[PDB]
Assembly symmetry: D2
Homo-oligomer: 203 residues x 4
């Protein structure tokens, strides 16, 4: 039932979990500590199929540009909603970058066009324009929500790619919440993953 | 839940994530008779994705010729006993040969299958007793040798499996496994199952064979 | 073989592996024209579609992001979208034509709806350049751009998955924009695999517009 | 392009879509410089950006013993079409003495060969008998040994193919499938030389392909 807030209005919420570290042990042996030893053994040599028997269901609220990257992970199940909020980058988001415009003003200019686009959308809607058409004016930082069911193996591949300094900061934050939850429900698998398979650097 | 299939096989439910409501939750993307109304609506309109949020893990013991057919379903996860490092055989019953006129009595056919299986197995043990590695010695064992595997699959894929295996076109032996699979599916997801039969099931036996 | 879609989009055939006979060869597992078409119709009629997985296409698509998001929901395929790390990035947007709004009674004339969409696109785009020039990283600045921004991708999919794509997108219930791309996809598919395409429409196509 | 494997098997190239440049065009998303293209292939492989290689596809026709096919069919990201056993041509894999020539046995390597050959013969005969008798082939075939040869068409993209080689072109895999993987590698090397060399240099996890040639 975990829920972690991300960005200004987003979140990653655990909906359900099937199995735990032992589910992988049971699959590896096809049965029902030497177990903690098996998990590391499987992880080191790359015998990842057993980890497919651990599944998670997440409910995610994220901006569309983050969701688009996320949806690139094909080995998972998705259900997106089909209620108007936008991700406004905080000023600290620009730290490290020397901008002509003070960080606060960048955050302002972003709020402004967002507000203008949204008002235009509302206007078109109020005039009878089909929502599917009017919505194309909305910006990429609009929040959407979706359910994500993914097994532990696919999830680790997701973390290898998004829990990395080379990934956009925003997606990293989401990947951090995903890892946090994965760690809570599968300590052994996660630790093992971190010790032998994790390719990123932020975890 | 363990259901015996054939002479020594079985389908045993290991774990399950969610139920009919999981698909309802997924469909609405949030947290009585209207939920069941939703399941039906999704099924009759081809909105299958919500059902991917229901997942099962089965433990199956079946003859290799049946497993081979089963493993053809790629949208699932499998873990089977290693033929290399990890001995019962399926002997059809005389009744299995009912309907086909044979030159010899059904029990004769049954006896003969039992005969070769016995010879193959005896030869196998002989090879092993001789120092022959199992990965090599096992190649003489027949296709009716029983094997075991864990199968994790979501409800949408499980329904595709039923469309194909719980049908008269599939070999009788796997139909039997498909019936047990359907039996378990129905008990864990009654609304989805009824909706499935009513609007999307393409097979024939599940609409004739109770549960 | 290229087809223009919307105002600045397109679907272009990049490569294709096999033809109708590739599904025949796979079905028979090996290696008379009417005997071959009969097998193809036979496979399609009984839902034996795996043989059609041995026909593959690679398309180059230029579409608005909102169309792309729906398209990318088809997981049994391969995609590579433009990033800017290997190729230059261009900025164009889908501006609906007044006709797109027919059948709908609007308080604002169609031409005025088109005008308003162009307006936001212009302002969103300029705010974007404003941010870039100010030293704001593109990854951050681009978040103000609208969903009608055109993007490009390569799409490799086999004929079976392709037919699933047409069943869902070449249909009146799918958004009009994606329908236009689906029609174009169907067309190239027909040109390269007429027997398979014919059979698809006769026994398996679930949609309506084709 | 056909290569014999084991005593009666083979791997045959049926078709192929694209080449090394298919990955380059996909990574650049452009459908319009050997030095630079080769550099990009290596860059992609070195940094794990593997999706571009999914736009290179192969179709093979394979003949292998069922015990080998069962291992092969475990690779799910691919397309398979196998001969229907439920609905001619029965051959079996008989290990040569050199196969066991490395393990201490209590009988001559040649005896194992004869032993295996015997049962295969006995099982095959019983099967033919049952068939003649009127027993459906889907039922009579269950007495056939796992070394029976089957055939299938295999369509797989370059990315998935490399995962297959990682796992099967390795000393940890059974010797028999190792032989097939070597043949697969040979064909792969011939059609996509750059991707293959890049594969071996930055991503290949097995042993044999860096030891054996082509
Ligand atoms: C009566 C009967 C006779 C049969 N005869 C033969 C035979 O002669 N030869 C033979 O080889 N097999 C035969 N089969 C096996 C048949 O090919 C299987 O149904 C198939 O291998 C597994 O089914 P699937 O594709 O529906 O399932 P899955 O592999 O689980 O896939 C589920 C869904 O995902 C899809 N999908 C998955 N991967 C891909 C992909 N790579 N490309 C496109 N779509 C994909 C499709 O939409 C599919 O319906 C037979 C089966 C039956 C029941
Ligand atoms: C009018 C309309 C409304 C829509 N509304 C919504 C909405 O509210 N929410 C939403 O999320 N989407 C919505 N969609 C998108 C729709 O769900 C897409 O068609 C779908 O996400 C992509 O199709 P697919 O699963 O058939 O294809 P693919 O992902 O390419 O899969 C092909 C086949 O393989 C299968 N398959 C693949 N992966 C799996 C898996 N992991 N488990 C089980 N089976 C699998 C199935 O048999 C499938 O048909 C809508 C589309 C339309 C036209
Ligand atoms: C810094 C960075 C830059 C990026 N740049 C680009 C870019 O320029 N263009 C772009 O398009 N994307 C880009 N991406 C997104 C990247 O391509 C995604 O990681 C990918 O689309 C989804 O990952 P996946 O294939 O590993 O995962 P999934 O799709 O979930 O697949 C999991 C595993 O299954 C596999 N697999 C699944 N389907 C197939 C298939 N059909 N064929 C073969 N193997 C398969 C592989 O073994 C894979 O690792 C970038 C990402 C990052 C972090
Ligand atoms: C030496 C050796 C020993 C073996 N021992 C055993 C054993 O004891 N027991 C046994 O059962 N098998 C065993 N196998 C078979 C092994 O499980 C296979 O490698 C596997 O079934 C097929 O590999 P794959 O997952 O890498 O490939 P594919 O199925 O082709 O998948 C390709 C890539 O896509 C992925 N992927 C595809 N589908 C999913 C999914 N549903 N969820 C998550 N990720 C997915 C991963 O990123 C994957 O690497 C062994 C193999 C070898 C070589």
């Amino acid at each position: 039932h975990m829920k972690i807030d991300i960005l200004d209005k987003g979140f990653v919420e655990l909906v359900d979990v099937m199995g735990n570290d032992l589910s992988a042990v049971r699959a590896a042996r096809v049965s029902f500590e030497r177990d903690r030893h098996l998990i590391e053994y499987l992880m080191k040599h790359g015998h990842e199929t057993p980890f497919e028997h651990i599944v998670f269901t997440f409910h995610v609220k994220a901006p569309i540009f983050v969701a688009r990257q996320w949806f690139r992970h094909r080995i998972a199940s998705y259900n997106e909603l089909s209620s108007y909020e936008f991700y406004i980058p905080s000023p600290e988001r620009l730290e490290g970058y020397k901008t002509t415009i003070p960080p606060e003003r960048v955050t302002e200019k972003i709020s402004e066009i967002v507000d203008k686009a949204y008002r235009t959308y509302l206007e078109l809607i109020e005039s009878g324009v089909p929502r599917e058409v009017a919505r194309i004016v909305l910006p990429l930082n609009l929040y959407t929500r979706f359910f994500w069911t993914v097994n532990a193996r696919s999830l680790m591949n997701f973390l290898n790619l998004r829990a990395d300094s080379h990934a956009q900061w925003e997606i990293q934050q989401y990947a951090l919440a995903i890892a946090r939850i994965f760690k809570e429900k599968c300590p052994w698998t996660f630790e093992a993953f971190l010790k032998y398979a994790y390719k990123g650097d932020i975890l």
